[PDB]
Design a binder for this molecule. Structure first.
Ligand SMILES: CCCCCCCCCCCCCCCCCCCC(=O)O[C@H](COC(=O)CCCCCCCCCCCCCC)COP(=O)(O)OCCN
Ligand SMILES: *[C@@H]1O[C@H](CO)[C@@H](O[C@@H]2O[C@H](CO)[C@@H](O)[C@H](O)[C@H]2NC(C)=O)[C@H](O)[C@H]1NC(C)=O
Ligand SMILES: *[C@@H]1O[C@H](CO)[C@@H](O[C@@H]2O[C@H](CO)[C@@H](O)[C@H](O)[C@H]2NC(C)=O)[C@H](O)[C@H]1NC(C)=O
Ligand SMILES: *[C@@H]1O[C@H](CO)[C@@H](O)[C@H](O)[C@H]1NC(C)=O
Length: 173
């Protein structure tokens, strides 16, 4: 519906062993799969939407996102008490409404099936979704809000890159 939605589920049995499963849909059709442990992560386009050189660039940046994501969970563990095993769910995307002056974009993170933090994209700030203050949540937010990587680069990815991908490829669906 002029939208790209991406889902990443990350199963941590311990800080150093993670299992990934995810997928992306474009206009409500499955277009990408994420699969495998950190030791060997498969990231696939089901439909050849990007040309080889282009997709290879996109794929390298996804792998790099994963490495930094994993580093942040180990850091939270390394600095606060983080109880494993745990499952993290990242749900993110962009939507072009027919009646919209702006894309709607989002990035929502849950832990163990409960709301944890989410991204306020235009101001490029992360917020807690948990009702109670927690050293884990507070420390995570401190990390997410302190660096350009998790603020301004992510805003660009959701507002610019995702939206330009929808405009460029929805007609294929
Ligand atoms: C185009 C579309 C292509 C389709 C791809 C489909 C693949 C299957 C979908 C599953 C994967 C989800 C993808 C996530 C996208 C990441 C985007 C990205 O690379 O952005 C970078 C910005 O850094 C960041 O965004 C850093 C964020 C790091 C932390 C994220 C927050 C999670 C917090 C939870 C931590 C755990 C808390 C502890 C309990 C560089 O962007 P660019 O250079 O590409 O532009
Ligand atoms: C990723 O794949 C999962 C698994 O198929 C999708 O989850 C399904 O979502 C639909 C809603 O449209 C439900 O009817 C199913 O019950 C869900 N399945 C499971 C196992 O939970 C998910 O929507 C996909 N996400 C993308 C591509 O962004
Ligand atoms: C996420 O869920 C798992 C399982 O539901 C939690 O693991 C439990 O942790 C407590 C204390 O660390 C143990 O007494 C239980 O036996 C564990 N259960 C299992 C199945 O291993 C985990 O602690 C949760 N983590 C967070 C951060 O919510
Ligand atoms: C990684 O896993 C995929 C799963 O299909 C496999 O095809 C590929 O050969 C593996 N690559 C490695 C182990 O370097």
């Amino acid at each position: 519906l002029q939208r790209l939605h991406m889902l990443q589920i990350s199963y941590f049995r311990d800080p150093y062993h993670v299992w990934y499963q995810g997928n992306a849909s474009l206009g409500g059709h499955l277009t990408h799969v994420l699969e495998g442990p950190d030791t060997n992560t498969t990231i696939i386009q089901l439909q050849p939407l990007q040309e080889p050189e282009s997709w290879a660039r996109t794929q390298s940046g996804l792998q790099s996102y994963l490495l930094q994501f994993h580093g942040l969970v180990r850091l939270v563990h390394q600095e606060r008490t983080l109880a494993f095993p745990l499952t993290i769910r990242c749900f993110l995307g962009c939507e072009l409404p027919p009646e919209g002056s702006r894309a709607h974009v989002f990035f929502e993170v849950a832990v163990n099936g409960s709301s944890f933090v989410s991204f306020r994209p235009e101001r490029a700030l992360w917020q807690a979704d948990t009702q109670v203050t927690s050293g884990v949540v507070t420390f995570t937010l401190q990390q997410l809000n302190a660096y350009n990587r998790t603020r301004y680069e992510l805003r660009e990815f959701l507002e610019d890159t995702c939206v330009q991908y929808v405009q460029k490829h929805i007609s294929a669906e």
